[PDB]
Structure formats: structure tokens, C-alpha cells
């Protein structure tokens, strides 16, 4: 059907409050399925998806050992970047990284991703071609210079095109009832008068997957629209709505249009009293 | 599975 894989690493420093903290979560499409924390007294790779719990103990000991060495790897990375900017040892700093492979409808990769950050700023990234890098500042070149000679991008090109695609594919089959089956939203339109001349028309979309959805308000001539967007529900589905202030008296003229993957055809809604 | 070995910064 469709596939995507992402890994969200996060390493922050707490001078005086202990050692740096490392947090890692895994994603397939918009469904989180891995969770790891360094501060737990029992730090183990926890799962958040029903289809992965099938994996044996060697899988979970592997994922735990990897993160138990990445917490020492980024702790030195925090000390190294602290030296590049000669930042004070009493300052808190954070490093964030994202990577993963993207599978295509044919079955092979389309775009492999790898990117890091420091204090919320882009630090270093792997290019579209998996071989090179792109530095953001002067200090990024220091780390770039090391990975140029250690063939770090060589490891990623073999991982993103190898184990990542092989396992992102295995996850699609073990959970195809939910990962390859999209659920259209539960849509309805509400209304609440604000004044004698104005009125609020809110269009709801509930319980949909994946997260991508479009909600717009339109008068038969054209389209206008307050849009708080894509909050989660906690049941691995998301909720979203769009509202518009309409003149009370001419209310029926406004229409709501929904564009979603799970819908066979785009919907058009009108507030029916 | 995540990336097996990580470089440092």
C-alpha cells in the first residue's frame, strides 16, 4: 500500500542535574511504535503498537543495547559541540536527530533521510545523494571533516537501502489491518451564534488516519477560515476542525470541503438545522 | 530496527 519510517532521537543536557538525557521514538507512517527513555531506572525499549509485540526477545535486547550506547555517544557529542563554541559547562543544550527510509509503491526506496540539530538550529544533514553532507556553520565542518574520512555516510547508504527497507516492509505485513487500511473521518458541522449579525460555522472531522487532511470553508463563489490543526486523539487517530464567522441570516451559503485519503470521493457539507 | 552504530559529534 504505502510506507514510511522515521526515528526521532533527542539528547538534552542538564548541568548539575545529572548526566545528559536521551529520548528515542520510532514511527511507521503516522503511528508511533517505539519508545525509549534514559531517565527510567529500568531503561528498556518499550513498544506502542500491537503489531510489533510479536517480535522476539533478541529484537528488544538489540534495540535496548543500541540506545544504551547512543546515550554515551551523544553525551560525548554534547561535550564536543560544547568545545567547538567553547560554551560554558553550566549551560543546558540539546541535540536532535531524525532519520529513516521511505519506501515507494513499487517496493524500493525513494528518499532516505538523515539530519541533526543543535539547540533547535540545523547543525548537519545528509544529502539527497547518501554520500555527502551539508554543513550549516563553522563548527558543523569540524564534525563533517571527521565523517568524510570515517565513511559514516557509507554506513547509512548500506542501512537505509538494506535493513531499513527490509524491516519497514516487514512491519507493513505484520500490521496491514491498520497500517495499510485508512479510516475516513467522522465529519459533521456545528453552529453557535455570537451576535445578531454574526455566527460561527464549525466543520468537524474526527477519527481519521493518516494525519494529512484539508478543511476549507467556501461560499459558492469562492473559498474563504480559522483552522486549529491536527491534534491527536490518543487512540492513534487525529482530530481537526475549521470554523468561519458567517453573517447570521445567510448561513446556509457556506460549504465545507474535506480531502482525505480514506475517502472514496471528496465530501461537501452544509449545516442542516 | 534503528541504526546499529552511531558516529559522534
Amino acid at each position, epitope marked *: 500500500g504505502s510506507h514510511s519510517m522515521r526515528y526521532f532521537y533527542t539528547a538534552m543536557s542538564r548541568p548539575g542535574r545529572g548526566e545528559p538525557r536521551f529520548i528515542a521514538v520510532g514511527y511507521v507512517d503516522d503511528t508511533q511504535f517505539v519508545r525509549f527513555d534514559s531517565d527510567a531506572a529500568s531503561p528498556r525499549t518499550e513498544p506502542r503498537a500491537p503489531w510489533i509485540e510479536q517480535e522476539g526477545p533478541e529484537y528488544w535486547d538489540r*534495540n535496548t543495547q543500541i540506545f544504551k550506547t547512543n546515550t554515551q555517544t551523544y553525551r560525548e557529542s554534547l561535550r564536543n559541540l560544547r568545545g567547538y563554541y567553547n560554551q560554558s559547562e553550566a549551560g543546558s543544550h540539546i541535540i536532535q536527530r531524525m532519520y529513516g527510509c521511505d519506501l515507494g509503491p513499487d517496493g524500493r526506496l525513494l528518499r532516505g533521510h538523515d539530519q541533526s540539530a543543535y539547540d533547535g538550529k540545523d547543525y548537519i544533514a545528509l544529502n539527497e545523494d547518501l554520500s555527502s553532507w551539508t554543513a550549516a556553520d563553522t563548527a558543523a565542518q569540524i564534525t563533517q571533516r571527521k565523517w568524510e574520512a570515517a565513511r559514516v555516510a557509507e554506513q547509512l547508504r548500506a542501512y537505509l537501502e538494506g535493513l531499513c527497507v527490509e524491516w519497514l516492509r516487514r512491519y507493513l505485513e505484520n500490521g496491514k489491518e491498520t497500517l495499510q487500511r485508512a479510516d475516513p473521518p467522522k465529519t459533521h458541522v456545528t453552529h453557535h451564534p455570537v451576535s445578531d449579525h454574526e455566527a460561527t460555522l464549525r466543520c468537524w472531522a474526527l477519527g481519521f488516519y493518516p494525519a494529512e487532511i484539508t478543511l476549507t470553508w467556501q461560499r459558492d463563489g469562492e473559498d474563504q477560515t480559522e483552522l486549529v490543526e491536527t491534534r491527536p486523539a490518543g487512540d492513534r487517530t487525529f482530530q481537526k476542525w475549521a470554523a468561519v464567522v458567517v453573517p447570521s441570516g445567510e448561513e446556509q451559503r457556506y460549504t465545507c470541503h474535506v480531502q482525505h485519503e480514506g475517502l472514496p470521493k471528496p465530501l461537501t457539507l452544509r449545516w442542516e438545522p | 530496527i534503528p541504526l546499529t552504530e552511531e558516529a559522534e559529534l
Partner: T-cell receptor
Amino acid sequence: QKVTQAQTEISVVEKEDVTLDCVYETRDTTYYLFWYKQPPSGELVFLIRRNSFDEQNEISGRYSWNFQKSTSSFNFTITASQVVDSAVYFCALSHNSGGSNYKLTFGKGTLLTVNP
Amino acid sequence: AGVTQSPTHLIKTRGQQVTLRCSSQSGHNTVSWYQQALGQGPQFIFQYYREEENGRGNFPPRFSGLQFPNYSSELNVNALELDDSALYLCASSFRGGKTQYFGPGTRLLVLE
């Protein structure tokens, strides 16, 4: 998993092309292959690095390597063998054993001797 | 001078303590120790990373190790036996491309 070098010893003469046979078995897809030469001093020198996504044929100098994923073999070929090429050649495999570690696994060892 | 290993040859009696040392290259951060018998290939003892053991394979607890912040490593082996006589090789890498640059080795011999 395991690596196997069936050739125990090889006796060749100068200017003769000798090939070395190294086969591997490995279910996980991502791995890094290697070839090492060990002169009688005892140390191993770094010759080659091969990966899973690389090509089938690759030749450099008198050394000609043949990596194919169907046969799961990395058979090595030495063209116009000289006296200096007499040593022990190992092929290793960098797989995932346990976790967070790509460990190496060396084969039995092929003794190559070039007689005058 | 990236690859060194001291000493070269060593003779000890059955049931003693030996400490083999190794120096890493300027750009490397890992040390992997191996043991090569006369017929077999180099078998993988533990690998160290930033003074904390990374992973060990098929060796008893008496085989121990330690890594110093200046990229210097050791191999503290206890309770020697006659079969512990082998060639002990030292490797180095930097957590990037998995390439192991071996050292000159150490010919250890244990006698009764």
C-alpha cells in the same frame, strides 16, 4: 553467522593466475565484507571493503574481486601472482552479533605459496 | 604512527597475569582485541568504546580489558592456561565505516 574458505593450501608458480574462494551465509541483509593479507610477520593489512549494495565485478590492479549476492560468495582472484603475494588471505564479515556492534568473523585461512 | 602494540613476544608460566597494551590511531575511538590460533582465524574478544565495554564474544571473564581517554587500551588476562598461547591482535575504528586496522600483534606463549 559463519564464513567458510574451503581452500586449505594453494601451490602456484610465478606469473600464474590464482583465484581464492570465500563463501558466506548470512540472512540479515546489511553487511560489510573484507579481505586481509597476513604476511609471516603476523599482522593483517587492509585490502578491500565490500558492501551489500555494491556492484558485481570490481578489479583494481592485479587484484580482481568477484562479489555476487546470488552465490553469496566473494571469490578473490590474483592475476600474475608474484613471490611477494605469498601469504595467508582472510575474508571477514562485519555482521550484527547481539546489538550495537558489527563484529568480524574470519574464515579458516588460505595458504598461498608462489614457487620459483 | 597510528598502530602500535607492546610487547611483541612474551613467555609466561601456567597460571599468571599478563597485560598487553595497544595504541590507537589519531582518528579512531574503538579498540577490538582478537585471538588467532595457529590454524584458525582471528577470534573476536571484547570491543571497548570510551572506557565502557561495547560487547564481548565467546570468552571467559578472566579475559578483561580497559580503555584510557588518550585512546590507549589494555588486555588484562588472568589465570593463564597452556591453550591461551596464541597471537593477540589489536584493532581500531571510529564507529563510522566498520573497518578494522589491525596491529602488529603479540606472540604469547604459556609453558608449564
